[PDB]
Amino acid sequence: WXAXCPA
Amino acid sequence: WXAXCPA
Amino acid sequence: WXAXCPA
Amino acid sequence: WXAXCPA
Amino acid sequence: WXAXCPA
Amino acid sequence: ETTALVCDNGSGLCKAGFAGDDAPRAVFPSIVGRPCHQGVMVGMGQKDSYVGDEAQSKRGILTLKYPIEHGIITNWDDMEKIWHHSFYNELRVAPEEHPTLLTEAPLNPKANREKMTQIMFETFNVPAMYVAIQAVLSLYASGRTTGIVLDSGDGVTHNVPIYEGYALPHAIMRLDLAGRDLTDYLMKILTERGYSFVTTAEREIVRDIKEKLCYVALDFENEMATAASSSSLEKSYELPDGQVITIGNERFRCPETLFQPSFIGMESAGIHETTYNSIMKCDIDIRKDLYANNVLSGGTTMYPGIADRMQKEITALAPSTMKIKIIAPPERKYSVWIGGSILASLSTFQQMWISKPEYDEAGPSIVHRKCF
Amino acid sequence: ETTALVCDNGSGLCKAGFAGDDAPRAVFPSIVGRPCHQGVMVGMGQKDSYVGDEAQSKRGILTLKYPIEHGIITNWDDMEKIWHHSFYNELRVAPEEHPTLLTEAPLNPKANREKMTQIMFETFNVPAMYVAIQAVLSLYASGRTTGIVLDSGDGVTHNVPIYEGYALPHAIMRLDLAGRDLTDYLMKILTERGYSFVTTAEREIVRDIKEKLCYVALDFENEMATAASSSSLEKSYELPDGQVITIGNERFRCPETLFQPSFIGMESAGIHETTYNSIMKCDIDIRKDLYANNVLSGGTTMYPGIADRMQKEITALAPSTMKIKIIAPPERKYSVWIGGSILASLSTFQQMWISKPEYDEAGPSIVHRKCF
Amino acid sequence: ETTALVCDNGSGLCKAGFAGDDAPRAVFPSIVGRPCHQGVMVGMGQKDSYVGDEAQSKRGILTLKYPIEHGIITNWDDMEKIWHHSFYNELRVAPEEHPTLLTEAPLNPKANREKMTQIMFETFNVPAMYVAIQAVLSLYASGRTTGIVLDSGDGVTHNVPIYEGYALPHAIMRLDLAGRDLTDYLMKILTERGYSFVTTAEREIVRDIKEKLCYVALDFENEMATAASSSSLEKSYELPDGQVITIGNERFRCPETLFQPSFIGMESAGIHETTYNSIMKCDIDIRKDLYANNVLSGGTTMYPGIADRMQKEITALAPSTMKIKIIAPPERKYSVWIGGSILASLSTFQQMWISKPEYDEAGPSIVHRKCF
Amino acid sequence: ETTALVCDNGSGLCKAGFAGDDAPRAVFPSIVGRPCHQGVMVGMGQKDSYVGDEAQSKRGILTLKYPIEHGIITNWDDMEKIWHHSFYNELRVAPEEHPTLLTEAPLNPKANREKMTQIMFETFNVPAMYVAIQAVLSLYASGRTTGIVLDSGDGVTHNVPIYEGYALPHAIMRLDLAGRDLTDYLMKILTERGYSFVTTAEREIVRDIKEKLCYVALDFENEMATAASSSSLEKSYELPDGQVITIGNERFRCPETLFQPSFIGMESAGIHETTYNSIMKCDIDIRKDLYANNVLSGGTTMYPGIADRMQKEITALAPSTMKIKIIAPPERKYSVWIGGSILASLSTFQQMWISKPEYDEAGPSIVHRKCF
Amino acid sequence: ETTALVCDNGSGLCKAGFAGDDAPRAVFPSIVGRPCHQGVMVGMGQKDSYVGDEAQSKRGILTLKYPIEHGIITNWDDMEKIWHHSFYNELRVAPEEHPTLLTEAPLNPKANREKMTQIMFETFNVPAMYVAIQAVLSLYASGRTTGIVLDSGDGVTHNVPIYEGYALPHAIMRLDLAGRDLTDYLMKILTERGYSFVTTAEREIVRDIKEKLCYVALDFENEMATAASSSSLEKSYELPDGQVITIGNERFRCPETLFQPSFIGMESAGIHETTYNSIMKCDIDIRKDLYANNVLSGGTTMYPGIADRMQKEITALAPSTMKIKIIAPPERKYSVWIGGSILASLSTFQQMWISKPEYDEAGPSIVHRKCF
Ligand SMILES: Nc1ncnc2c1ncn2[C@@H]1O[C@H](COP(=O)(O)OP(=O)(O)O)[C@@H](O)[C@H]1O
Ligand SMILES: Nc1ncnc2c1ncn2[C@@H]1O[C@H](COP(=O)(O)OP(=O)(O)O)[C@@H](O)[C@H]1O
């Protein structure tokens, strides 16, 4: 994603 | 609640 | 190990 | 070689 | 010996 | 002679203290945390349930559960744990020497009040107990005797009008839209910018973001156009592990659900229309007295744009010859507890306690006859 | 008059073809392989990037990267390489003469869709383009107009309910648990028997093992007891270099993460509870119509025990007077592309393409207004 | 009442002693040496297997074998010889009167632990036994209850995070790169200067060279340019037969494989990236507490440049507002044994021993239920 | 436009010729002979050093020295004499008009390559030069692009695997056991039958005996029992002075050192185990392609039993479901030179010559950057 | 219970005696003398063969033949005569009641040992026999268990290293340069001063001169300059018929062939270089233990300058940080027999005799399996 994933 | 919520 | 090491 | 052969 | 001595 | 206890058990916060005081002594989140892993280190004391602030300080290894949802207690063992932590660990008193005053949202199931009475009389057995309505306590803390109270907390947003000390039960409105729904909607709309929050600790982080950064727009379309035009409304928040996120229009798109419930797929009207419909259902001769005495209470009404927006919407709805006043005290986050302390310290209130022999004679059904 | 192109860009497989066809013409793994060594032999043609099946046939000397993870494009140059290989080397068409239909997961970041629109309008410049939701395409390919679609692929498992052609956006659920997590968990639990897999080619081997040999248990505890009792569930697999491995309970412990996410340390609920919560968040009068129209799609739902297990779990959760039906067509691995071909061939769809002058007038933000 | 025994059986060193002590009593290399020639002189006692230091003092006429490779026991007769030499010749105790604590690497085969239990209960039959994880023992010896442990020895480099006594099993990472791979890489790169080492005794000589002379560079390219510029980093070592060799950049090119595994053709990432990925796989609210409690243990982490390099690399990877601390105690070569002595002397540990009747009732499978 | 020169300088034979040819023009033994007596006859031309075949034709009054041992040049004046005899007396060309291609064993000292470059650019100053790996040239002459090459000459036996033109540098193995060790072992074991060879000319005689009469047994114990049973394997050889010797089991006990190095007191494994360990150190997905493409090169692999024995040993080591193929071309004694002629005639090779201005700018260290 | 016999049959001297003694009882020259003239006097007993000292006392009318040359028995009837004289006339025992221990040089023909076993079991039929290596017996008599033995007698100079009771068979060196070659070289160089010796009795006279007057120079060139400068090194010897000869530099030119074999036209290196090459062919970790345990044995090593010269030459060859010690006991002329007496009296040696039923079952080939 960008804040709580990765990705 | 118990008939249309939950709770 | 037994399939991808040795050991 | 020079340390563990000769050569 | 028999091939490069004698003896 | 004994000091009574006032305990406001909201859906997200528990506020307990002594009667006659100005502020509640113990304010803690009403959560129960349980470990979802296995403790490999032995020697130190590890418990099975963490209650309150200890659940918040260790929330990275715990699953958090709320015992109360929409003002209705769903888990009774967890609610008993919350009450035990409030009585013994926070207030540090024996419950059998003090009468206890409790609050409840209107239009609630009767079994909630009956089981509350049964638990207070059989597990934490009190000399006396009482259940009050939270909006009546907000009007008690306001110091006036007339007005319509809009109380919005973590589970329930309810409107109660009272004229000259007389309540109007047919005009009482309840809407199940409050701060937890706003937290869920913010969690849903934070994925547009690329931020993902799915766990309960991440829900607490999103709740902290909503408390710190959100505000109510005076005009929604103009503020949306201003946010789309320039990046002057963007704000930055620092995550607990160090990342910095930035939000734009989501500062005002989140509390707009209070005025437009269709953002979360709800058929109901906004809080301003609910207040206007509650005023319209009363008698005509009192209606003007309800127009100038709108009282706000609860933590949901603490957004720094909500009083002007509510005043503008009600002035649009009402006829132009009436005066519209919104009373928003700065201490309205704890006003229910303040009114509970005012009510429990009154000399005329000592004769309407529900005593232990009355509970023994009548069972857990006396609370429907001695209360609202 | 020109034939449109349908390109489903999943997290693990790219499926591209022409509209109006029954099956996609080009199905290839969406990986980019790069050499990690030095080419000492000169004369023949060695490239710097291997795309698709050529990456799979030479994976012993390449590092493989997935440009899409959890339905989100992380590397855009690799994604451009994937799209170039799909257009020119597989479909063998010029992209400037055909409108292109693309798919996307729900609750995705907006920048993903905006950059897809910008890339297809500026690098592979199309006359028209559109972005659709994959579960709506699965319901299009199912032939019905109502039902709740559970689509599980390589990165995203999402539930979308649709009643009479109307979607319910507040009941759409997204869970980031799919087949790549199952492959990683299978790699983690294969070390118990003495098999080690750490590289990306070994990840592809473990994915092949999971596709060939895994199945969903109807009852987990009974199957675990049966596997612990006798070696009747053990199966043998031949490695590419000649070794033969044997697996037992890991055939059904690997897709059990779909129903128990806590195996990989995730706080979320299973797919059956996610489906039940998506049903119960809708209106009551449509809920029965969502109980008999559960539609499965995606490659993750191709385990040969998953329909009976989902039926049993939902029947346990739902009231007993309702009928539960799980629709599992045999072609559900490609059903998103089939629905994309059905949608792009419709005469009523030709007026909602996003044309090139609209992109020139509005920039790369028109896709938020002309799509979902 | 009887004193327990702590025996850390590493891949290159065996450390055995009594519980409650500060340092292990017997530290000896875990090798078995066998003669490759014929003994022409009769009269004196020549044996068939030399175990431990006697294998090192006579290594010029012996072939040396390690029974443990990458934390996995490959030869069980040699491991039984190692355990017999540890119990009878070094500690000089009867094993049937003392419970024994053993250590094991995470993500290991189950058959290793099962055969360890079977050999400990049937050949050196103990009243009780237990198998522990080495990083948990390193955190036990550190004196704290939270932190992420990077343990690197002779076969295994593993990261284990623990928060408030709770382990995170999904974030445990294991990399098969340790000091024996560094010794092999030093043997490979020592041929550039004209030194040839091919035998097992020469491997021990190269291991001694690596222990005495190698160090971790803070910046690899600057140190390579400095070594290419002037001969200020060159050091001299004296061989056992009298020759003197000189090494330059190979002092820091050998432990650079820990941070760049592609030097030995491995696709994995470095130890700093493994630590960062193990931190980022945990929950967010604990991540800061893992940033300031990085604990180093094992003999591989004893290079005199590794703490500053690890601090710099993790500070580059982490966000800038977090504090990074690397805990490197001077006794970290034996910290696993020290934590085992702390754990075995606890009063709360006496109820989780695996006793002999439990092994008699359950067979060699109780260790999967009473341990990690 | 100028024809390049290919010069393979092995440990026992020097093979020089022109690029683009099929066979090397000059094949001569790389020895330097010096007189050990005093010339009492005056008038004719007696020299101080005899190089090549003139050393072999007059070896009865000369001491012969090999300038190269185990692929390492030990005497540089003698190597300069070898190169001068190769360029001027055999090829009969001026070295300043032709680029020269040279070969080298893997895992060699860097100073050997650096002094080779310095001598080629300062004494026999070439327009361009290059150093190649001999196994890569053997795979070039084989015509294929994948496979594992076992090259065994007079000093070095090395295994190099190459997959699709990419080398595997971490799987390259070098063993210092080749035909000179076999000649020394034959010299040692010929004393059992009563034949004594101690001088260098007698070493050449024993080398001729080994080339003419030795063979690799398929089964060593069965052939030893057959030789002990009847005198059917005995063969006769005529000495240069007229004596006739007879050998029995020594025909197959001499090349058995290639499979059992412990005959000469070496701790290393055989060539079949070295090839198997070189295959298993590669990636898994390429291992099958290395099983069917075993390429033999060098004069040591010219025994008339070695292909079947290597096939049998690798088939015993490998899993039974794999196909084992040993490629043994009849021209494999000169295959390194043939691959050097193929490589030097390529149009894509003309841009990777090390030119004279590059040597002038960079010194004798450019060969580490423009070669292997 | 019966006393064993130890018989060292050297190339020039036969030393026989009983096991358990300190010195050999019978030491006699191993020569056979035959008359070359006609006996014109009748009445007294004239024989056809004179054996031993009787050959030396009457050597003026006899031709003397050595049955052993370079440790190889050439004449078997003369060897049988030597053994018969040793058993019956010198030791005066019956050979059928005593086991016999024999010595042999390393790297000898197998037929010599086989015919020795056949003659000892069929002509002088013993209950048991054994064949041992002379350098191992010298190390037995030295009292130590490690070291490298240089044994030089009348035909063979051999180096054997032994570490901790284990022999190193690949480092055993044999050189065919000993005291008979020195006697022949002295016979050659005595013609410069005008002395002619051509017969076998004159060869015995020259051997006596070499035993009495020769010595090893510490520095050869300085002693040559000293001998050329002044006549201080000249010594006088009295011939048996009354003449007095004088020798100068030939006192040290004769044993210089041991260090410079090119004096007699041999391509081999000196004894110091042979010892150094035997040391460097062993493993590295034992080499220091071979540097301080150089053991000298045999009559050739009895020159009164050889220990300091060997120490100086080995110290020049070895690295300077190693300690060089030459062990030269005063009884080293008979040390092989002393070690044979030590070995034959051991209690652990009685189980490795080659008995008569083993010879009857296995023929004359058991000695290759029960010995070195
Ligand atoms: N400053 C603030 N701004 C916006 N929302 C707030 C603020 N403070 C509290 N809240 C919200 O109000 C709720 C708590 O209000 P309160 O009435 O005390 O809850 P309860 O229903 O437990 O009594 C929380 O859900 C919180 O999200
Ligand atoms: N027969 C099968 N059994 C189990 N899993 C499968 C099977 N076939 C494919 N899969 C899994 O489904 C995934 C691909 O499904 P798909 O929906 O086509 O992926 P994408 O997300 O690329 O569209 C792969 O990760 C694969 O592991």
Ligand SMILES: Nc1ncnc2c1ncn2[C@@H]1O[C@H](COP(=O)(O)OP(=O)(O)O)[C@@H](O)[C@H]1O
């Ligand atoms: N001072 C040092 N510097 C670098 N490496 C060392 C040092 N001391 C020991 N080592 C390495 O550490 C390893 C032993 O560490 P340890 O953790 O005791 O091994 P084990 O895995 O047997 O427990 C050895 O392989 C050795 O090469």
Ligand SMILES: Nc1ncnc2c1ncn2[C@@H]1O[C@H](COP(=O)(O)OP(=O)(O)O)[C@@H](O)[C@H]1O
């Ligand atoms: N017919 C043969 N059979 C066995 N060995 C041979 C034969 N011909 C040559 N050899 C051996 O091969 C070696 C030469 O091989 P080659 O690879 O040309 O040597 P170089 O290392 O000089 O390139 C020699 O040492 C020789 O003993």
Ligand SMILES: Nc1ncnc2c1ncn2[C@@H]1O[C@H](COP(=O)(O)OP(=O)(O)O)[C@@H](O)[C@H]1O
């Ligand atoms: N004092 C001496 N000085 C020099 N050489 C001697 C001396 N004594 C004996 N020798 C030589 O040593 C040889 C005998 O040594 P020994 O080892 O006993 O012979 P064998 O080979 O018969 O065992 C004789 O050839 C003799 O020339």
Ligand SMILES: [Mg+2]
């Ligand atoms: Mg409240």
Ligand SMILES: [Mg+2]
């Ligand atoms: Mg998909």
Ligand SMILES: [Mg+2]
């Ligand atoms: Mg360890």
Ligand SMILES: [Mg+2]
């Ligand atoms: Mg060659």
Ligand SMILES: [Mg+2]
């Ligand atoms: Mg002797």
